[PDB]
Amino acid sequence: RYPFNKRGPREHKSWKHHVLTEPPKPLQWRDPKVWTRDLSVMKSFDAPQWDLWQSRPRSEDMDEALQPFMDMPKSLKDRRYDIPWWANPFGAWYLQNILSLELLKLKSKTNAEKIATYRSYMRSLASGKDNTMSDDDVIRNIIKERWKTLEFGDRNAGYPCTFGDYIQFLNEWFKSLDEEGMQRLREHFDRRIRPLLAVMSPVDILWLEALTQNSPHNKEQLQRKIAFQTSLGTPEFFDMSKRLRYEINEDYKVRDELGPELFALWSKAPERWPPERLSKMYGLDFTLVRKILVWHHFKACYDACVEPDWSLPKRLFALEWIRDVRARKHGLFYGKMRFAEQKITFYSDRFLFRDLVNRREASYANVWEMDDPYRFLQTEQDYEDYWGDNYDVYRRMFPEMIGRTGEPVQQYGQMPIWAGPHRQHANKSEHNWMFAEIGVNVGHEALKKLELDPTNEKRRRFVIRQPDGTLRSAKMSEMRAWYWKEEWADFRFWAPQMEWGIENTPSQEQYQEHVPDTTDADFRKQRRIQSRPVKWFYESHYTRTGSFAGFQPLRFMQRRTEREVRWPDVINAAVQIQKRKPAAYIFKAIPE
Amino acid sequence: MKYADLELTTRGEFPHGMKEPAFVKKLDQNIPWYFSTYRSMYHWPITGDNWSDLNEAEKHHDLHMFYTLAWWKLGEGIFGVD
């Protein structure tokens, strides 16, 4: 019942003044070691992260690749002197072990061995020794184990390199990369590291640190844990070297598709070689073989040191392209249409008959007409969907899609005032006066273009009195001001800018708190820094598409708001997310 | 190039991303519903070709890739010859 029968609202510890001060604040005595150089904030003494650059807007970071060198003071960086790359002891190690083949000695084969090997290589007879290992494989094994046996440390002791020495060479090298240099790098990374990044597991962390011989925090307890857990499987089960070993579809290997097929032909007249001629080569399904053909073309191009046709993926997949364009325009979204969003129509069994007899009875003058790439297209809508991407082809082919013409702003003749100068002051005033017409024939959105059409004589009438007393027709913007606001965004080529995003929505709707807007390092918005140019200036104009507000912003406001859970009394609708307000507020003076 | 002989005593632990976290017993908010109830504003992957003067995608990807390659020592000992 009524809470306040027999006692008023309780003010007990209303300041909760036990929360106001800690009775120990600060001084002029702050230890220069443990504070910032400015004594601004306390240093953080937990172990160094290597990614720190992503959370802080400091620009000296991006001048160097690896983190500990980003953190390095200028006074120290001055004392790194430029010397030949192999004068770096790790570069020396790399030069001796990996790059110098000539110093590599192989165990010499006996004469018997030479013979048995030769006769194995030339003619295979079954049951034989499966090894017969190529000296190429052997050599590469010796090299990879030279990468195994490489350990860092004090080099007055056994090992070749300081760790600092290694990452130093690494840093000099990463800054040194060209375009195709760091392309080769990222390929190398996607092929080796990335799959491992997917197959890892806590069970490996010790081994994972054995690569660099770095010592972990928990090392004894990890020893025990990992011992007990690796106990539960085969030792081959658990070693990360062998976890990638099998690949589905062994009939077509990526290694064998590196040489592209019939490259000495479709290079020389690529038009006479539609995807069909080549697609008869592979026993795979349609999507896969076209995919592969694309990769062939690209590999070939990079091999011949020329640039690849980037229009090729659009050309082979053309049907998929247009389906995606029209889907994007239909359901309003940017991306690639997936299965869930397909129409649920159920065709009859014989649905394809008309097209079947149309195909079966087709005839063609030459074979080029038979498969040209553009037979997919009939109407103008087809050509407008197929080329919307190149503003080259599009601008040349559809000149009328960029409006270069408009109804000119014209001055109306004034009505004569018989009162003469006595009233001439009157229509000359402070402001502009807009007048738009309304009535039964005007103001209907349905008819809007007909009403702004300069050809139509019933066209809605506007007028403007300029402060000097003249009258002119409305500018087209001013005309459009008098209709309910219209949203134009077409999703079919480039993504229109969408409202209620992270960088769009201002604070109070996005979070229920005020969040300061600084152009540097918003942790909440997961951005490192912002240079803030004028939005549409540097970007190409065809790229600007529109805006879409046409949905509910669910973080902010939703329909049919209710309590998610009635008990406990604490939960509300999912729109009420918020941090706890404290016991009474403390204000620290903030010039600091 | 630009070499000094430097001593770096402490490198933080491996960025495998998986480390047993600090354990507690009691928690501040005892209300697990907040996990499932929390929404946010939309993350839109792209606006208008995604052009930026600071090249974010490329630059951040490479910077991560660098220390990743450093820690795996270029993944160069791990794979034998299959």
């Binding site: 005595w29 702050r30 230890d31 443990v34 003071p73 | 770096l8 402490t10």
Partner: peptide, 21 residues
Amino acid sequence: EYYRWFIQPGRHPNPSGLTLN
């Protein structure tokens, strides 16, 4: 910012921050 590479992670040399005298 360079200090972080030479510290021992468990050791927080002066947790109070105050040198006093």
